[PDB]
Amino acid sequence: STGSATTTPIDSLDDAYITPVQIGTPAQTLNLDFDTGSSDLWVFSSETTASEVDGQTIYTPSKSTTAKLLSGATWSISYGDGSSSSGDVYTDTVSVGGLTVTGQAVESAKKVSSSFTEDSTIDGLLGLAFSTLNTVSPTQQKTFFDNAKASLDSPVFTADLGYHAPGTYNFGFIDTTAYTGSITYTAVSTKQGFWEWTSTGYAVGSGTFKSTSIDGIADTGTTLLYLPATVVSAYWAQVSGAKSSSSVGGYVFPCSATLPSFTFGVGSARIVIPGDYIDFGPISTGSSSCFGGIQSSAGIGINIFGDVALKAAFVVFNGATTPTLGFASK
Ligand SMILES: O[C@H]1[C@H](NCc2ccncc2)[C@H]2CO[C@H](O2)[C@@H]1N1CCOCC1
């Protein structure tokens, strides 16, 4: 089997991407944030505190003839931005772009933090990291990809995120027309439950390439590119007037500046992030100070190849017995 679904930026800045997901019988279609940095499928629901729902489409398990309450199961998750959600668990039928999993754990939110409430375009998350990170207690549950893997033509999924444009998540096959050149594969550590890999280095603009190992995770659920302070300083040094602002919470730059590209290494291969991918617009409405899309990972404790990086590539998440990651230019 295979599945294929279009993923869409939620706003003009590509702050996140949503992908339609069918849940239950008859189908309830929710637009979910596919997140390769976490492993819970959770949704706004009929059980979510009314004051915490503001525009989202909700899952109503009582209207799904295939929904079954998972007795005694609860979940609670917190993300790197301080956001959180929690609730109980159903199993139900879940389909993504024609690919169907029966008995998928669907985690129904009773509570969500304010940042989720405020984001009307995101109806929940679909985690695609390794199932070891799933928060369902007292019995941990499997991700959608884990549940589908054995039925797929090939045990893989691919992320093809667009810059200010639609993109695609495919399951079970590699679309050889979606990229240029070759896919370079690189080793993955699953020891922290992430798609964790080691970049071979970087370049800033037309600068010489610096060979240096950068360990980080491929995370579709993070907007920006988070890299070591040394690297990030080297990047913003090439932008006149850029500086790190504590008040704003990172590097900002004059909106009139021309941003240099940023290149990261995958083995001997190179992925080039165009400069305008790194522009996240005025820090507040009407400001001529803009927020940078490359930021220091010093506070986070881990390097994150988020959407800013991933949308510059066609990315293969290979879930073979020994998982690997593939990157191609596009
Ligand atoms: O990018 C954010 C994510 N929200 C993106 C977002 C979604 C929707 N609208 C705006 C932003 C969530 C998931 O992991 C973190 O929090 C991630 N960062 C990690 C390190 O820097 C701090 C936060």
Query: What SS3 string covers the chain?
Result: CCEEEEEEECCCCCCCEEEEEEECCCCEEEEEEEECCCCCEEECECCCCHHHCCCCCCECHHHCCCCEEEEEEEEEEECCCCCEEEEEEEEEEEEECCEEEEEEEEEEEEEECHHHHHCCCCCEEEECCCHHHCCCECCCCCCHHHHHHHHCCCCEEEEECCCCCCEEEEECCCCCCCCCCCCEEEECECCCCCCEEEEEEEEECCCCCEEEEEEEEECCCCCCEEECHHHHHHHHCCCCCCEEECCCCEEEEECCCCCCCEEEEECCEEEEECHHHHEEEECCCCCCEEEECEEECCCCCCEEECHHHHCCCEEEEECCCCCEEEEECC
Alpha carbon 231 to its chain's center: 22
Domain boundary pick from 153, 174, 195: 174
Whether residues 108 and 247 fall in one domain: no
Residues 43 and 126 in one domain: yes
How many structural domains is the chain composed of? Answer: 2
Do residues 180 and 106 share a domain?
Answer: no
Q: Is the CB of 175 under 6 A from ligand 1?
A: no
Strand order in the sheet with 225-227: 269-273, 262-266, 196-204, 210-218, 303-305, 225-227, 294-296
Q: Is 222 in the pocket of ligand 1 (CB under 6 A)?
A: yes
Q: Give the other-Cβ count within 10 Å of 81's Cβ.
A: 11
Of 60, 52, 56, 8, the closest CA to residue 34 belongs to: 8
CATH of the domain at 310: 2.40.70.10
How far apart, in whole angstroms, are the C-alpha atoms of residue 226 and residue 304? Answer: 5
Choose one of 145, 174, 203: the last residue of a domain: 174
Of ligand 1's listed atoms, the one at least distance from the Cα of 82 is 16
State whether 277 and 212 are in the same domain. Answer: yes
Last residue of a domain, one of 174, 194, 209: 174
Q: How far is the CA of 10 from the centre of ligand 1 (A)?
A: 13
Give CB contacts under 8 A, 24+ apart, made by 241-244. 242/292, 244/296
Contact yes or no for 132/283 (Cβ under 8 A):
no
Backbone Cα Rg of the chain = 20
Looking at the fold, whether 167 and 83 belong to one and the same domain comes out as yes
Report the chain's terminal Cα–Cα distance, integer Å. Answer: 25
Are 95 and 238 within one domain? Answer: no
Q: Same domain for 328 and 182?
A: yes
Q: Are residues 165 and 179 in the same domain?
A: no
How far lies 277's CA from each of 67, 243, 296, in Å?
A: 41, 18, 17
135 and 201 in a single domain? The answer is no
Cβ 15 under 6 angstroms from ligand 1: yes
Q: Given the residues 14, 33, 35, 88, select the one marked as catalytic.
A: 35
Q: Is cis: bond before 26, omega within 30 of 0?
A: yes
If asked whether residues 158 and 182 sit together in one domain, one would say: no
CB 16 near ligand 1, within 6 Å: yes
Statement to judge: residues 157 and 50 lie in one domain = yes
13 and 137 in a single domain? The answer is yes
Q: What is the experimental resolution, given in Å to one decimal place?
A: 1.6
Which domain covers residue 287, as residue numbers? 175-330
CA of 272 to the centre of ligand 1 (A): 22
**Ligand 1 in contact with 69 (CB < 6 A)?**
no
Ligand 1 centroid to 17 CA: how many Å?
12
* Determination approach: X-ray
Decide if 199 is catalytic.
yes
